[PDB]
Every structure is written in structure tokens, then in C-alpha cells.
Amino acid sequence: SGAIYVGNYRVVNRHLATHNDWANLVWEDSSRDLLVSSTTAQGCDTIARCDCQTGVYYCSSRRKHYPVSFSKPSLIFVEASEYYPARYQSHLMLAVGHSEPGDCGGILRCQHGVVGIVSTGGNGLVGFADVRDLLWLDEE
Ligand SMILES: N#Cc1n[nH]c2ccccc12
Ligand SMILES: [Zn+2]
């Protein structure tokens, strides 16, 4: 689990979005595993605007932050999951690291701020849904 809170936006994994998230839907992309909902409270997170390929992510299944090198956001084939069929996920960044299903929502961060959230795992890889292209998260 986990979310990004920026302005009046809550960014979550689309497959973990709650009734409240869907009732307050701003934007969702199935191909990216992202959903953004509106919030009444002002969020404190800053989104990275950059093309960093290194950062640190939080891994709930290890209670650890790990530094990683990750690929630029791409269209990648993602095996079967208990929350998705085998399919192509877009805007996905891969690193070598540990990721189990409950690690979804762990934040990847660089010096510029939040890069994305854990979205995929298995085979010793961790996949992160990029948010840095969603420039609209940064105003109203
Ligand atoms: N987990 C974690 C964090 N590491 N660095 C941060 C900076 C701002 C907010 C949260 C964190
Ligand atoms: Zn950066």
C-alpha cells in the first residue's frame, strides 16, 4: 500500500484505489496502473521533474529503503498478478530489487522529489509507475 499526496491530489495504484478514490476520480490510466483522486486536505509531497535513473525506494516487505538504478519509463510486458492479467503496462520503470504485491505504493524518490510508486514485482525486479510526466499534478 501507499500513496502520493500533492496539492489536492492523491496518487495511488489503480488496482488499490478505494470506493472513495473512484467516487472522487480525477484521472485514471489502466495501462499505467495509476489513479488520481481529489482530496479536501492540501498534500505536502513534491513530484520530481527530471530524467534521473537513480533513486531510493521504500520496500514494505523488507521495512527497508533501497537505492536503485532504473530504466526510463517504457511499455513493458508484466506477467500475471492477483490484481491484473498478463498485459503491457506503459510508463513503467524497472530496477533490480525486491517487490511483492503489498509493496505496491512504495515511493521511489530522487533529489528532485517523488519519481513514482511501486507497481510490479517478481523475478528479482521491481517496476515503478512513473508520475514525473503528469505535470498537471503541480497546479490546481
Ligand atoms: N519514506 C520516506 C522518505 N524518505 N525521504 C523523504 C522525504 C520526504 C517525505 C518522505 C520521505
Ligand atoms: Zn531526479
Swiss-Prot record:
User: Which chain regions cross the lipid bilayer?
Assistant: none
Question: What reactions does this protein catalyze?
Answer: Selective cleavage of Tyr-|-Gly bond in the picornavirus polyprotein
Q: Where is the signal peptide?
A: none
Q: Which domain of life is it from?
A: Viruses
Which residues does the record give as Zn(2+) 1 binding sites? 50, 52, 110, 112
- Residues annotated as the enzyme's active site: 15, 33, 104
Q: How does it assemble?
A: Homodimer.
What function is annotated for this protein? Cysteine protease that cleaves viral polyprotein and specific host proteins. It is responsible for the autocatalytic cleavage between the P1 and P2 regions, which is the first cleavage occurring in the polyprotein. Also cleaves the host translation initiation factor EIF4G1, in order to shut down the capped cellular mRNA translation. Inhibits the host nucleus-cytoplasm protein and RNA trafficking by cleaving host members of the nuclear pores. Counteracts stress granule formation probably by antagonizing its assembly or promoting its dissassembly.
Q: What's this protein's name?
A: Protease 2A
Species this protein is from = Coxsackievirus A16 (strain G-10)
Q: Which residues of the full protein are shown?
A: 869 to 1008 of 2193
